Design a protein around this nucleic acid. Structure first.
Ligand SMILES: Nc1ncnc2c1ncn2[C@@H]1O[C@H](COP(=O)(O)OP(=O)(O)OP(=O)(O)O)[C@@H](O)[C@H]1O
Ligand SMILES: [Ca+2]
Ligand SMILES: [Ca+2]
Ligand SMILES: [Ca+2]
Length: 342
DNA sequence: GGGGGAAGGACTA
DNA sequence: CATAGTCCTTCCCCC
């Protein structure tokens, strides 16, 4: 199998650079201003000019400002990035039918039937990079290998504006030399737990009692790392299997005023439909988190399929039913979609 | 056997 | 609640 992975480089910040070219070359830091007080919140993504000085994903905005007081700090514009992202995903759609959109900034293409080998996979990666740069002026990094995991690792290694193939032999080498912390889906907490079991490489998970490994990190992650270590990993590039897809936004002030709530609910729906993409729900649940943090929800099933605009109007009715049946103010409001058609 | 929902955990998917 | 959101983990009801 030949898998080609694409990640859009320092995406939120790059998009901002594209919408305002004067920012290029200067440190740029997109942040999620949490609203608790001036500069509360954490950095979402920073460009490389900012990473040079340690400003990066997840550190407090207040700290970023101490290290780089004169950088350009911008608020998160999730909607803008989703729109720019969907267009890029549409371009990727031209290169393969088997595509798996993983998040707003990345996707996997199974190109097993479009190319005969890595040399051709590589030329295709350059084509793709050139297409996106041409259409949207956004640089991306391509990772190519025998499965999803190694294709992503290659992009992580080659970024930004890069391309890299990890052939079968290097896969065998990496299974032995790759810090476990660098494996997709594996974060710090799990990394630390394994360090403590004296595990630092994929290969290491092959010399420990499965039940001892499972006991520390869960069955799913234990099988996972193991199937990789045995170069036995092979999961299809399939549209992800999801129970429900939703979004819950925290409002600025608790409320029970139908008109005041609406906007937030709609932003929730908007975002939700962007995340649903081709998937079509039959069920919609409106979800409210009350002032005292209780969860209240009212849903409805539609034998046909729920269009975005129908979700807009049917949710409002569900929201009204909630207000009539619970007199508490609402703090957070959102929606959930489930039971998809095939 | 596994869908799928509740509530807390871990990853940036 | 106390960086937010997304997705994962564990457990239990239920088909
Ligand atoms: N600790 C964090 N807190 C909040 N948001 C985070 C955190 N880490 C990552 N993110 C968000 O997740 C997205 C991805 O960031 P991450 O640093 O993993 O990106 P990456 O795709 O590997 O890419 P790049 O080098 O292009 O920025 C964005 C932001
Ligand atoms: Ca990225
Ligand atoms: Ca990414
Ligand atoms: Ca990452």
């Amino acid at each position: 199998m030949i898998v080609l992975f694409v990640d859009f480089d320092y995406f939120y910040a790059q998009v901002e650079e594209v919408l305002n070219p004067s920012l290029k070359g200067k440190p740029v830091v997109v942040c999620v201003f949490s609203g608790r007080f001036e500069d509360s919140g954490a950095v979402a993504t920073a460009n490389y000019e900012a990473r040079k000085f340690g400003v990066k994903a997840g550190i407090p905005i207040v700290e970023a400002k101490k290290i780089l007081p004169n950088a350009v700090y911008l608020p998160m514009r999730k909607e803008v990035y989703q729109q720019v992202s969907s267009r890029i995903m549409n371009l990727l759609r031209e290169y393969s039918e088997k595509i798996e959109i993983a998040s707003i900034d990345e996707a996997y293409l199974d190109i097993s039937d479009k190319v005969r080998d890595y040399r051709e996979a590589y030329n295709l990666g350059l084509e793709i990079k050139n297409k996106i740069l041409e259409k949207e002026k956004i640089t991306v990094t391509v990772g190519i290998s025998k499965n999803k995991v190694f294709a992503k690792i290659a992009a992580d290694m080659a970024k930004p504006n890069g391309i890299k193939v990890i052939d079968d032999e290097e896969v065998k080498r990496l299974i032995r030399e790759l810090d476990i912390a660098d494996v997709p889906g594996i974060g710090n907490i799990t990394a630390e737990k394994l360090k403590k079991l004296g595990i630092n490489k994929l290969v290491d998970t092959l010399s420990i009692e499965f039940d001892k490994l499972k006991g520390m990190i869960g069955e799913a992650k234990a099988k996972y790392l193991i199937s990789l270590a045995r170069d036995e990993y092979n999961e299809p590039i399939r549209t992800r299997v999801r129970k429900s897809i939703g979004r819950i936004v925290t409002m600025k002030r608790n409320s029970r005023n139908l008109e005041e709530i609406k906007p937030y609910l709609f932003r929730a729906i908007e975002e939700s439909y962007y995340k649903l993409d081709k998937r079509i729900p039959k069920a919609i649940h409106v979800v409210a988190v009350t002032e005292d943090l209780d969860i209240v929800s009212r849903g409805r099933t539609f034998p046909h399929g729920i269009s975005k605009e129908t979700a807009y109007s049917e949710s409002v009715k569900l929201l009204q039913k909630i207000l009539e049946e619970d007199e508490r103010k609402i703090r957070r409001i959102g929606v959930r979609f489930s039971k998809f058609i095939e």
